[PDB]
Amino acid sequence: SDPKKKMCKERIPQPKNTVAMLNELRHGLIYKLESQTGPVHAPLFTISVEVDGQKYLGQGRSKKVARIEAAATALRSFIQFKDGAVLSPLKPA
């Protein structure tokens, strides 16, 4: 099927997003949709952000979500507090 979200003029105003955090940390970050799949009720978007040579992957139900997910991984790669969270999807098919 492939539900191709063509509308990118819709903002879905949700600041405090990790992608903004990444822009405060390191430049050269490219958020690119490497793969798009999933159902129509909740498709799976796979955004890859390449930062400092490390490609961080984020998989969400929209480009926006996936972009956030990608940046989240990147953030903890730079600064890492006493999080110790095992919340990290390792290739979830």
Place of tokens 């930062």: 51
CA angle 11–12–16, rounded 5-degree value: 100
Judge residue 44's burial from the number of C-beta atoms within 10 Å of its C-beta, 0-12 exposed, 13-18 middle, 19 or more buried: middle
Helix ranges (DSSP H) in 1-93: 18-25, 63-78
Domain holding 55, by residue range, is: 17-79
CATH number at residue 37: 3.30.160.20
CA distances, 90 to each of 9, 15, 83, 87 (Å): 32, 26, 18, 10
Let me know if 22 is exposed, middle or buried by CB neighbors in 10 A (0-12, 13-18, 19+): buried
Give the single-character DSSP code of 36. E
For 62, the token pair is 């929209």
Closest to 55 measured CA to CA, from 38, 83, 81, 32? 32
- Take residue 90 and report the two structure tokens written for it: 């390792």
